[PDB]
Design an enzyme around this catalytic site. Structure first.
Site, PDB file in Angstrom:
ATOM      1  N   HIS A 196      -5.919  -5.517   3.248  1.00 55.97           N
ATOM      2  CA  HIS A 196      -5.630  -6.324   2.062  1.00 55.97           C
ATOM      3  C   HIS A 196      -4.748  -5.564   1.061  1.00 55.97           C
ATOM      4  CE1 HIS A 196      -9.922  -4.829   1.625  1.00 55.97           C
ATOM      5  NE2 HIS A 196      -9.342  -4.209   0.614  1.00 55.97           N
ATOM      6  N   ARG A 241     -10.118   7.143  -3.264  1.00 55.46           N
ATOM      7  CA  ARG A 241      -9.259   6.319  -2.416  1.00 55.46           C
ATOM      8  C   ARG A 241      -7.825   6.847  -2.442  1.00 55.46           C
ATOM      9  NH1 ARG A 241     -12.079   3.502   1.122  1.00 55.46           N
ATOM     10  NH2 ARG A 241     -10.421   1.917   1.267  1.00 55.46           N
ATOM     11  N   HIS A 277     -12.766  -0.693  -4.867  1.00 51.68           N
ATOM     12  CA  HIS A 277     -13.688   0.363  -5.289  1.00 51.68           C
ATOM     13  C   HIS A 277     -13.725   0.525  -6.805  1.00 51.68           C
ATOM     14  CE1 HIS A 277     -13.802   1.528  -1.023  1.00 51.68           C
ATOM     15  NE2 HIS A 277     -14.912   2.173  -1.336  1.00 51.68           N
ATOM     16  N   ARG A 325       0.835  -1.201   0.000  1.00 49.04           N
ATOM     17  CA  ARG A 325       0.000   0.000   0.000  1.00 49.04           C
ATOM     18  C   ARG A 325       0.874   1.256   0.000  1.00 49.04           C
ATOM     19  NH1 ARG A 325      -5.921   0.047  -0.417  1.00 49.04           N
ATOM     20  NH2 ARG A 325      -6.568  -2.052   0.238  1.00 49.04           N
ATOM     21  N   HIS A 377      -4.441   4.118  -2.309  1.00 51.40           N
ATOM     22  CA  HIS A 377      -4.220   3.525  -3.633  1.00 51.40           C
ATOM     23  C   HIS A 377      -3.368   4.395  -4.561  1.00 51.40           C
ATOM     24  CE1 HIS A 377      -6.331  -0.229  -3.533  1.00 51.40           C
ATOM     25  NE2 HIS A 377      -7.474   0.317  -3.161  1.00 51.40           N
TER      26      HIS A 377
END
Lengths: 624, 624, 624, 29
Positions: free
Chosen positions: B498, B573, B505, B421, B579
Site C-alpha cells: 500500500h 519503519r 504505524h 514508497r 517510509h
C-alpha cells in the site's frame, strides 16, 4: 447520493436505534435481600446475611453486620447516582451508635498514620510496615450507571436470580468451592480421565485433607431435602435452573464448564500452556511456551505462590478482611533456583489450581484471550470463510468487548443482585456452628451446613484449617486454638471489593472468546503434531519444568480451546475461592450478548453485505 | 426524568452529531500524480513515477510502469467502491497489449503451480520451495471507505500535501533514508551525544560505507537550488512546511522525532528496553526486561536478523518485488548459543536499528503502546488528577484507537495521495542513472540525484550494494556486476502492498500514546533509580546481553518516553526503508486527532463532569 | 375529519409500523457448516458434508465436494446481493485447479452443443435428445432478499436450528425417508388402523423390500447412543426439540403430521379425493371427484407415473444430478386404456404415495389449497361467525399468502441454514460404506449409518436398489454391479436446486390453510353422508377407478381436513424423497406466522372492528 | 448502511407516498 458526513452520522444513528429496539429485559433477583430477618429491640430488621457486606462495619465479637442502617446507606448510594450519599456510608471497623436508626458512622479510622490497634489479626495489625493495614473502598460502585457508544447498554441486558441459601443448587456450589480450596494444590493431570494418559502428583507434597475421588463423591451425594443438584430431573427445576443444570460429576467434567469442548482433553486450555514456533527458523517449538508476540515473545510461566499457604482460615483474619483490611501483596512466592534458567521455579508453567488462581489474581482483563488470539495468528489459523479476507480488527475487537462487559456486570453486581461472596458464606457456616447470631438470624444457613456436615466436608475443612493456623503469622490469633469452618482463601485480601453475582472475569471471558470464535474459523483443528496415530495435546508435567504430551483420538478445535480457556479463567476465580459456579455460567452468557450486540452494530459500518457465524455456548451458531 | 433506553440512545445520537459538527477539512495533495508526463506515440501520458505502482505491471527491461491504463483501472477501482472493477486491474508481470489504450491485462500468472520462469531474480524464482514466488494483492484497498461507531470518520480528518520530487525537503528525506540503510547496524549508543556516557560498536562489525558523523554532514549540506531543508528560514516555506520543519542536524536529534521528550536521553525509549520488578518479592529488577504482564511476563528481547544482510540491492530483485513477488519470511535469523540462557543471541535486546526494523516488521499494531501501558501500570504510575480515580479503561482504550487510525490513514494512502514508497524512489535514482525511461520521463528526479551525488552519498550506496551483491542468493543476477543505486532494504518483500504517505504505524502510534498521555499523569517522572547524584536511564550494551546505564541530569517523564516510543516505532519503519520522515510526523498528528475525537465522544457516556488534560505533540495540552 | 388520500396513506403507514414493531427474532442454525472438517495438505478445511452443495462441482470418483473454495464463492454470492460474484461460482462438473485456494472454476461445460462426454450415467449422457443433459442453475438464490408490501418481512421471522448428523432425531428422519421410498407404491388404505375398514394392495404388485409393520418397528427401535427420538423424554430434549417431538409410531400416525385432525381417519385429506355435486341438478355426486370450479370443473385424478420406477439408485446417476444434470421430464407415465373413459389409467385418483409424489412434483404452489377452498365453497361451508357476512376475499387471500411464504423460506434455505437434501445424506451413507472420503471426512455420518444398519434398513435399500439397477437405462452404469445405499428417488432430477431446510411446499401450505381456517368456520363438520349410523369418509379404491367409503364414529371437520391436506402436500415431498420431517413441521409454523401477520395488517383497512378466530397447529386459536 | 427492519418499513412508506402522489381524479356522473 448523499455526502460522507450524513452517511457516517446515519450509520451511528441506526446503530443507536438497533440497540434501542433490542428487547430490554426486566431485572429480577432471588428476593433474599430483605427476606431474611434478625431480631432488634421491639421488632425485626433485615439480616443481610445473603448480601455483599464487605467493607461495611462488621461486629468484632459476633462477626456479623453491625448496623443494618449502614447497608441502607450503602444501597441508597448505589441506587441513586449520588456520591455524597455513598460517602456517608461507614467503612471498616465502627462503633455502634447510642440511638438506634442512626448510622454506625462512628468510623474507627480516618486520618490515622498508626492503625494496628483496630485490627484483630496479627497479619492485618502488623502488615502495612507495622503501621497496620489500610482501608480499601468499594471498587467502581457506580460503573453500571455509565453508558457506551457501541454494544448494548449496561441495563439493556440481564442475568437471572441467583441460587438461594435454602436451595440444593447453592449447597452443591459452596461444597464445590470448599472442595476446590482443599484440592488447590492438586496436579492438573488429575483433573481428567486416567484413560487419556499417566497422571502425577505435584512435586511439593502437602497435607491434603481431600482427594479427587472424595470430591466426586461429596458433590454427587450432597443434598437438601433429599435432592442432589446434579441428580434432580427437569420437572423440579425452573427454566432458568434447567439451562445451567449439570450432569453427574465425573473425573472428566469435575470443576469444568459446560460449553462445547470443555469436556474434551486436559483441564487446562492449550492457550494457557503452549506458545508459537520461534519467528523464522525455529530455535524452539510450541512446547516451549513462547507466544509469538510480534518479533518478541510472551512467557507462559506464571509466578509460583508458596504452595499450601491459604488465608482467612480463622475468625480474626476473616473478620478484618470483611472490615476492608487492605492485605494485597502479602502473599509469599517461591525463590528462583540459581542453577536453572528462566527463573525456575520462581516462574513455572501453570501446574496446580494455585498457579491458575495466581494467574487470575493479576491478569489484565483480556490478557488470556489476547494471548490466545496471538497464538492462533502465529499458528496460521484461518478466519471465518464468510468474512471477505486482517489481524488488526480481531486484535483490537477482542479488547473492545471487555469494558462493555464490565459495565453490564457492574450493574448486576451492585444495582441488581448484591450476592454475598463465598467467603461471606464460609463465615456464616463458622458463625452458625459457634452459636452466634441474634435469635433466628442464621436459621437460613442451617439447611446448608447440615448437608455439608452430612457428607463429612466440614470435618475436612476444620482439619485443613487447624494445620493452616499452625503458621506463625496467625498462630497467635485467639481463634486459632478452636475449630474453624471458614473457606480457605488463596489471597490474603480475599475477594475484590464488589458483590459476587455477575463475575467480572467471566463476563469479560464470555465477551472476548465470542469475538474470537466469530472471526476465526471455529471448526479449525489445532494440530500440535501427531504421535502413534493419535493427536498431540499438552498439559504441565510435575514441578512445571516443561509440558507433558497426552494423546487423544480426535484433535482439539479452535472453539473448544477458546471455550475451555474461558472456563479456566472464570473457574480459576472459583479455585481462588471468590466465586460460585453460577457466577461463571451466567456471566459467560451475559458477555456473549454484549459481544454479539457490538458485532451487530459494527455490521452497519461496512458498505457491503457479509456474514460471520459465531458459535454459542448453548450449542447453536447465531449469524450476524 | 426519562428511561435508561432513551438516554443511552440520545448519548449515542449526540456523539454522532458532535462528530458531524466538527470541521471537515478538504483533501488536497501535491499535484504530482498527473503532472509528470512521458512520451507515447502521437502525444504524452502520465508517467506516475511519483505514485505507488507496487503490484501493477512494471516493464522487465526498463523497470518502469508498463502501461498507464493499469494505473487508471487501479485508481478507478479505489475511487469507486466496486471490487469487480478493481479486480480487472492486472497484477504482477504482464504482457503489453497490441492495441494502445487497452489494459495490459495479459497477466503472466494466474493458476500456475510453477512460476519460476516469470521472475528475474534468483531469490524470487527459487523462493517458494522452488516453485517460484507467488503474487500478493494490495492489502485493504477499500479500508478508507469503512465507517465507525466512535471517533471521527476516515474522511472527516486529513493530512497536508506530501513533499515533491523537485523539493529540497524530499531530497533531504531520501538522503536520510539512504543514510539509515547504511547506518542500519550501528549501535544505538552512537545515536546520542557522547557527553551522556561511553559509546560502543556492535559486536558484529561489518563493512560500513557511512559513519554517524558523515550522515550529519550530508543531511546538513544536501540542497536543491542552493537551499537545505534544515537551514531554510520560515519565509521560503509554506505554513504546512513551517510546522514540520526541523533544526540543524546533530548527534542528539539525528533520526529522531520532534515531539516533546524525543531529544532527551538515549535514542530508544525506556519502554522498549526495561520491564517491571518481578511480581511479589523480586528475583530480578527492571533492568532484566521482563514486563509484569499479569502474573506472567513479556520478554523485551527481539529476534535477531542476520546482521548486514539487506535486500533489493540490484535491478532483478527490486523489479520482482515491484511486480508483487511474495518474498515474506525469506529473512535469515541468528541461531541460539547452547551454553547461554534465554535463547541468546537468537533473541537479544534491541541493539541496532536492524533489531528495531525487525520489531516493527512483525509487531501487532498496538503492541509497543500496550506494553508501555503495562510497564507504567506495574511501576505504579499515577493517572490524570482531573479524572476521578482503573487500568481496565486505559488498557482497552489504547487498543480501541488503533483501528480508527488505520481507517483514516488508509483513505489517505489509497484515495487521497498515493505517494511512492522510498524503494520506488530509490529505483528512479538507479533507473535515471542508467539512462532509462522514454524521452523526458525521469527529468523530475534529475534535481534529486544531482544533489544526492554532490554530497557523495550515491558513491556510498553503490559501494554498499556491490558488497551486498557478493552474496550467493543474488550474485548470479545479471545486474549484480554493474553499479546499483537502489535503496538497501531490511525486508526481502520490502514495503507492504500500500502507498507510502500516511504511515500505518505512525497513525496507530499517534492515536495510542495520545490515549496513554491522556489517562496517565504525563508529568510523572520515571525514577529507574539514581547513581552518583544523577538519574538512571538504560540503553542496550554491545551484543545485547543486557542493558547499560546512562546517567542524566534530569529524570525521564511519562510523556517524553511515550513520545519517544511513538517515534521509535514510526521511525523504525524508516530504518527498515519503507517510509520517509513526513510519513511519521503528519501521521503522528493524524492519529492524535482520532484519539482526541474518540475521547470527546466517550465524554458524553459519563453522567458526571470531569476533565482529562492530554498533551499535544506541538507543545500545548488540550482539555477534553 | 380528514381526506380519503390521507387515511389511505396513514393505514398503509400504520401497517408498516405494526410490521416493524413485531418482535424480530435472531437467526440461529446448527453450527454444522464450518464444524465438520476434512484434511487438506498442511492443515484442514470444512467438508461441507452437511450442507447443500447441489450444482457445485463434485468429484467424479469420490462423489464429494471437489473444492471448498467453490462453496465459499457460493456462500459469498448469497450473503451479499452481488450477482456478479455469484456468477463466478462454478457449476456442474469441473476440473480441480493446479494451485490450491483458487476456484475450481474450470467449468467443463459452457457453450457446448454436445455434452454427453461429461456425464457419467447413461440416463444423463443420452437424455437431452442424445446431445447430453444440460446444466441447471440455483433457483432463486436471492429471493430471500426481496421485500413486500404486506405481511412480515422475509428476515423478520425465522426457524430453529435443524437436526444434526450426530443427533437421534436426524437418524429417525432419514430412516423415515428411506422407509417411505420403499413404501412408495403402498396403497393408501394401509396407512391407517385396520379397525376403520377393509384394506387393499395396489393393483400393480411390485418386489417390496419393506412392509408397513417393519417400518413401524424400524422407526420405533432406531437409536443413537441408546436413545430413540420418539421414546426420549422431555428432559433430554431442548425446548425447540420438545415442541416438534412425536409420540410412539403407530399405523394411525405413521408418516402423518402432528396438527389437529391429522390422526383422524384416512391418510389422504378428503380435499385431494372428493369433488362437488354437479352444478344444478346432479349428474354425479361428491364421490366422482369433480370440483365445482365455477360452471366448469377440476378433475381430481393425478397422472400415473410408472409404478416402482425410482431414480438415482447408483453412483453414476446420483453424481450427475448432484452436478446439476437437468433430467426433468424423463419420468415415464402409464398409457390410457382405450375402452375406459376419463383417460384411465393414464389418470387415476391419488392411490399410492407415488401418485402424491407426482402431484407435488408439478402442483402450482397454492393449487391444493385453492381447490380445497372451492370444494368448501361448493359444499356451502359457512364463514367465521365473527366476520360480518364473500368468496372473492378468501379465494384471492389464499393465493396472496403463498409468495410471502416463499420469500421468508428462501432466506432460511439459502441465507441461514443451507441444510443438505435427503439425497445428499443418502450419498454420504453410500460414500461412507465404500470407504471414500479423505481421512476423517465422513466420521460424522458413522453414528448415523451404524444405527440404520443395526435396524436392518440398509440391507433393504441395497436389496431395493439392485432390483432397480436391473433396468436398462442404468444397468450399463459401472456402479450397478456393486452394492448401492443411495436413497431411491421418485424424480430423475431429484430435489429442486435449493437447500433442504425450510420447505417451499410446507411454508406455502402453512400460510394458505391458515387463511382458510381463519375465514371458514373451522369447526364445521363436513357431512359427506351417513351409512349404518356412522359418518362417510372416502379413500382411493385399488387401481384408482373410484373412491371407497370408510365409516367413522365422528365426522370430519374443516380444520382437520385443511390440516391434513397441509401435511399431505408437505409430507408428499418426503415421499418423493426431497425433504425430512423437520422441513414440514417448522415450515408449517413459519407460514402460519406469515399468514397471521398479513391478516393483522389487512385488519386496519376496514373502518369497522370485527374479529376472526384462526386455529393454530399447536392447539390454541389466536384472535386477529 | 441501515438495518433490514428500517428498509422494509421505508419501502412500504414509499409505496404509500407513491400511491398518494398519483393524480386523484374527481368523480363525475
Amino acid at each position: 447520493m448523499n455526502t460522507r458526513r450524513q452517511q457516517a452520522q446515519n450509520i451511528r444513528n441506526n446503530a443507536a436505534e438497533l440497540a434501542a429496539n433490542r428487547p430490554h429485559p426486566q431485572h429480577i433477583n432471588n428476593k433474599e435481600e430483605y427476606e431474611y430477618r434478625r431480631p432488634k429491640k421491639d421488632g425485626n430488621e433485615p439480616s443481610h446475611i445473603a448480601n455483599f457486606t464487605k467493607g461495611l462495619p462488621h461486629d468484632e465479637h459476633t462477626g456479623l453486620l453491625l448496623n443494618s442502617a449502614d447497608y441502607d446507606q450503602f444501597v441508597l448510594g448505589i441506587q441513586s447516582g449520588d456520591t455524597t450519599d455513598f460517602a456517608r456510608t461507614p467503612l471498616g471497623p465502627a462503633e455502634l451508635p447510642k440511638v438506634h436508626g442512626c448510622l454506625s458512622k462512628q468510623k474507627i479510622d480516618c486520618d490515622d498514620d498508626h492503625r494496628s490497634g483496630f485490627w484483630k489479626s496479627q497479619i492485618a495489625q502488623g502488615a502495612a510496615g507495622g503501621d497496620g493495614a489500610k482501608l480499601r473502598a468499594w471498587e467502581s460502585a457506580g460503573a453500571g450507571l455509565v453508558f457506551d457508544l457501541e454494544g448494548p447498554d449496561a441495563q439493556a441486558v440481564t442475568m437471572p436470580p441467583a441460587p438461594r441459601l435454602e436451595s440444593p443448587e447453592l449447597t452443591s456450589e459452596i461444597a464445590e468451592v470448599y472442595s476446590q480450596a482443599l484440592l488447590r494444590d492438586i496436579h492438573f493431570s488429575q483433573l481428567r480421565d486416567p484413560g487419556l494418559g499417566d497422571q502425577v502428583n505435584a512435586c511439593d507434597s502437602c497435607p491434603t485433607q481431600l482427594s479427587i475421588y472424595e470430591a466426586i463423591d461429596i458433590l454427587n451425594t450432597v443434598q437438601i431435602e433429599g435432592q442432589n443438584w446434579f441428580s434432580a430431573n427437569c420437572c423440579d427445576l425452573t427454566d432458568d435452573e434447567q439451562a445451567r443444570q449439570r450432569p453427574l460429576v465425573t473425573r472428566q467434567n469435575i470443576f469444568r464448564g459446560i460449553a462445547p469442548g470443555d469436556d474434551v482433553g486436559p483441564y487446562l486450555s492449550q492457550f494457557l500452556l503452549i506458545g508459537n514456533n520461534a519467528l523464522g527458523g525455529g530455535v524452539f517449538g510450541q512446547e516451549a511456551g513462547h507466544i509469538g508476540y510480534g518479533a518478541i515473545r510472551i512467557d507462559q510461566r506464571v509466578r509460583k505462590a508458596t504452595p499450601c499457604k491459604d488465608f482467612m482460615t480463622n475468625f480474626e483474619t476473616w473478620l478484618d478482611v470483611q472490615n476492608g483490611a487492605d492485605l494485597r501483596g502479602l502473599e509469599t512466592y517461591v525463590d528462583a533456583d540459581p542453577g536453572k534458567c528462566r527463573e525456575f521455579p520462581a516462574y513455572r508453567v501453570i501446574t496446580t489450581p494455585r498457579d491458575l488462581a495466581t494467574y487470575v489474581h493479576y491478569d489484565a482483563l483480556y490478557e488470556a484471550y489476547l494471548n490466545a488470539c496471538l497464538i492462533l495468528l502465529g499458528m496460521g489459523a484461518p478466519f471465518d470463510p464468510g468474512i471477505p479476507f486482517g489481524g488488526p480488527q480481531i486484535l483490537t475487537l477482542v479488547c473492545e468487548a471487555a469494558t462493555r462487559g464490565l459495565k453490564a456486570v457492574r450493574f448486576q453486581k451492585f444495582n441488581v443482585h448484591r450476592r454475598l461472596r463465598p467467603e461471606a458464606l464460609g463465615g456464616l457456616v463458622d458463625r452458625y456452628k459457634h452459636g452466634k447470631g441474634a435469635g433466628d438470624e442464621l436459621k437460613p444457613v442451617a439447611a446448608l451446613v447440615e448437608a455439608l456436615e452430612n457428607v463429612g466436608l466440614l470435618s475436612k475443612v476444620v482439619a485443613h484449617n487447624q494445620l493452616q493456623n499452625q503458621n506463625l503469622d496467625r498462630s497467635g490469633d485467639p481463634s486459632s486454638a478452636g475449630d474453624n469452618y471458614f473457606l480457605p482463601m488463596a489471597f490474603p485480601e480475599g475477594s475484590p471489593m464488589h458483590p459476587s453475582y455477575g463475575a467480572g472475569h467471566a463476563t469479560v471471558a464470555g465477551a472476548c472468546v465470542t469475538m474470537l470464535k466469530a472471526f476465526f474459523d471455529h471448526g479449525w483443528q489445532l494440530n500440535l503434531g501427531m504421535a502413534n496415530g493419535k493427536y498431540i495435546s499438552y498439559e504441565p508435567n510435575q514441578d512445571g519444568s516443561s509440558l507433558q504430551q497426552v494423546l487423544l483420538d480426535c484433535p482439539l478445535t479452535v472453539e473448544g480451546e477458546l471455550n475451555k480457556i474461558a472456563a479456566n479463567i472464570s473457574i480459576g476465580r472459583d479455585w481462588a475461592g471468590v466465586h460460585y459456579f453460577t457466577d461463571y455460567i451466567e456471566s459467560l452468557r451475559l458477555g456473549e450478548k454484549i459481544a454479539i450486540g457490538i458485532l451487530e452494530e459494527q455490521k452497519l459500518t461496512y458498505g457491503e453485505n457479509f456474514t460471520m457465524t459465531v458459535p454459542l455456548y448453548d450449542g447453536g451458531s447465531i449469524q450476524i
